[PDB]
Amino acid sequence: RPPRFQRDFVDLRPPIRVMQWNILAQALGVEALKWEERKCLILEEILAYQPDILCLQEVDHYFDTFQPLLSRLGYQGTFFPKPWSPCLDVEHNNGPDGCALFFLQNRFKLVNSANIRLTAMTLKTNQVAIAQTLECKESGRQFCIAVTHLKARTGWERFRSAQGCDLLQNLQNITQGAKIPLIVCGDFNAEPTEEVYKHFASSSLNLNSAYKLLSADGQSEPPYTTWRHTLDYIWYSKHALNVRSALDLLTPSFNYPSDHLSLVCDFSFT
C-alpha cells in the first residue's frame, strides 16, 4: 500500500489541522521519478490529510499547479519566492521556488499578511518567510501562522541562528507579544542541537515543538524528518494551544514524493 496510507495519527488528547511539507522543488529533483507522476503523489498526500492550513517550502510550481488545483478545493493561497532561487541555476527550470501558505477559506478569514525576507546581522539573505494572521469564522478567535525555509547545510549554523532570530523578532511584532497565539511551520535545516533550535525553544514567545509529543516521554524530537536528519518542526504557543494529534513517522507509485516527510498536527485552543 502507498506510504500516505501507511502513517497513522496518534491521539494525544473542532480542531485546526496544520500540515508542514518541504515538497522538494521540481528543478531540484537506478531510475528517477517524473514530475507529472510526482506532482500527483504530492497532491494525493495533501487530499488524504485534508488540512485546514497547508505550509510549504520548495514550491516551484505554485502558479501552474498548486494554486489552481487547491483553489478549486477551497484553499486560499499565498506565495513568496526566494530572491535568488537555486532553481534558476538549473536548465529548463519552472522559475523560482519559494514558500507558500494555504488555508481553507470557508473556515478562516485573512486578517493581515507579511512577506518577510529574512536578514542575518543586517545582511539580506536568500531566505524568506510568510506570516499571516487568521480569524476563525465560527469563534472569531485569532491566531498567527508562519512558514519558513532556513538556509541549508553544515557550515551555516551561525547564519541560521541569526536569521532565525530575525524571524522571531518579526513574529513578536506581528503577534504583539502574546496577544495573538502563534504557529510556526518550517524546514529549519537544523537538528535540535543547533542554536537556532535552542532560540526557538527558549524564546519569550513560549513556543514548543509539536512532534516531541510522539516520543516516549514527550521530551525529545523524532529521529528523522527526512527520507538521517531531523530538520522539520511545527512550533506552537504552549499556553494557548494544545496538540490533540500528530501524524507518526514511516518505516513506483509507492515512492514517497519528497525527501522530507510531511508533518501533520491537529490543534485546538486551550
Q: Which is nearer to Mg ion, 51 or 186 (CB)?
A: 186
The least CB distance from residue 227 to Mg ion, in Å, is 11
Least Cβ distance, residue 259 to Mg ion (angstroms): 6
User: Rounded to the nearest 5 degrees, what angle is found at the Cα of 144, between the Cα atoms of 123 and 26?
Assistant: 60
At a CB cut-off of 8 Å and minimum separation 6, what does 24 contact? Answer: 58, 257, 258, 259, 260
Which position has the grid cell 529521529? Answer: 223
Is 187 marked within a binding site?
yes
Q: How far is the CB of 143 from Mg ion (least distance, A)?
A: 27
Per residue, what are the HEC states of 63-109? Answer: HHHHHHHHHCCCEEEEEEECCCCHHHHCCCCCCCCEEEEEEECCCEE
Spell out the residues 6+ positions from residue 196 whose beta carbon is closer than 8 angstroms to its own.
Answer: 150, 157, 160, 161, 163, 164, 165, 188, 190
Answer yes or no: is 83 a known binding residue.
yes
Amino acid at 105: Q
Q: Which residue stretches of 103-202 are H helix? A: 157-174, 195-202
Which residues on neighbouring strands pair with residue 187, listed in sequence order? 149, 232
**Which position's Cβ is nearest Mg ion?**
152
DSSP 121: T
Shortest reach from residue 141's CB to Mg ion, in Å: 33
Least distance between Mg ion and beta carbon 127 (Å): 11
Name the residue nearer to Mg ion (CB basis): 69 or 152: 152
Flag whether 131 is marked binding: no
Q: Is 100 annotated as a binding residue?
A: no
| Residue 232 labeled ligand binder | no
92 annotated ligand binder = no
Task: Pick the closer one to Mg ion by CB: 19 or 134.
Answer: 19
Measured from the CB atom, the residue of 87 and 210 that comes closer to Mg ion is 87
State the minimum distance, in angstroms, from the CB of residue 45 to Mg ion.
16
Three-state secondary structure call for residue 49? helix
* Cα 117 from Cα 83, distance rounded (Å): 9
How many CB atoms are closer than 10 A to CB 12? 15
Interface positions with Mg ion (CB under 5 A)? 152
Nearer to Mg ion by Cβ, of 15 and 29: the residue is 29
Does the annotation flag 106 for ligand binding?
A: no
Residue 64 marked as a ligand binder:
no
- Give the nearer residue to Mg ion in terms of CB position, either 57 or 209: 57
Give the contacts of 197 (CB within 8 A, at least 6 positions apart).
Answer: 188, 190, 191, 233
Residue positions forming the annotated binding site for substrate: 58, 82-84, 126, 149-152, 187-189, 260
Residue positions forming the annotated binding site for Mg(2+): 58
Residue positions forming the annotated binding site: 58, 82-84, 126, 149-152, 187-189, 260
